[PDB]
Amino acid sequence: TLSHLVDVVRRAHPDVDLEGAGVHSGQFHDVLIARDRVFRFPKTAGAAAELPGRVAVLTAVDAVELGVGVPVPLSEVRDGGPHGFLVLSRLHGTPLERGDATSPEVIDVVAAEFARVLRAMAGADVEKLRLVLPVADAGRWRGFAGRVRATLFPLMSEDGRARAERELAAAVAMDHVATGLVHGDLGGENVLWQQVEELPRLTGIVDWDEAKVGDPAEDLAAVGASYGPELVERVVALLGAGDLWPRIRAYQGTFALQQALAGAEDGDDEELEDGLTAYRKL
Secondary structure, three states: OHHHHHHHHHHHOOOOOOOOOEEEOOOOEEEEEOOOEEEEEEOOOOHHHHHHHHHHHHHHHHHHOOOOEOOOEOOOOEOOOOOOEEEEEOOOOEOOOHHHHHOOOOHHHHHHHHHHHHHHHHOOOHHHHOOOOOEOOOOHHHHHHHHHHHHOHHHOOHHHHHHHHHHHHHHHOOOOOOOEEEOOOOOHHHEEEEEEOOEEEEEEEOOOOOOEEEOHHHHHHHHHHHHOHHHHHHHHHHHOOHHHHHHHHHHHHOHHHHHHHHHHHHOOHHHHHHHHHHHOOO
């Protein structure tokens, strides 16, 4: 097929060199990663409704004015190829390694790069975002707990189950907050940085698949898990978000179960095993 998809790209985008071009497939989508450009090709008539969804999410997030790049639709969605395609900008930069992020001469700059984005996200017009983006569901953690018990509890030690029930409970116990833009997966791999005159600059954020109107504590939890307490304390201090700590820890206590449940539901055995290590001694 990919020579057809390449045929579609060469026909629509004659300039694009597919020699040494990234390729990421699936049951859902083929993606050609060119130099300046990404091409998403749905595989079924159903997955094609993703394309306007991706446009609408990226357009709404762009309209918030985060102060950092997000992928831009470079074309309209087109009905070329079997089920249509979308051309997005490619953002440049690299994830910050935890040791680079936390050096004493950069940790203040890194904290403020996270803070200025998170502040703009927390301050988004949620009345506008709610017409386009998903909204955090108040029942979300009760549902998640049901699935973790159905799917993962059998594979656990008794101690594993006791530990999981406490972590699931801290999440179910949170009152519902839907006051801001939430990226929803703001681990370090999704945040791109460049050295700008010898100091880190947060230049782009990618992978807006889980974006929603939600709780700003959820993205602080992810920053904390990727970079550790020294960085997230500085981000929280700068934002004046010290009231959020109990919610931040409740999100973080769910990250291994989130990983394990995803592993099971997605057939990724490494994620399932890695997620479950704290929940079985055997």
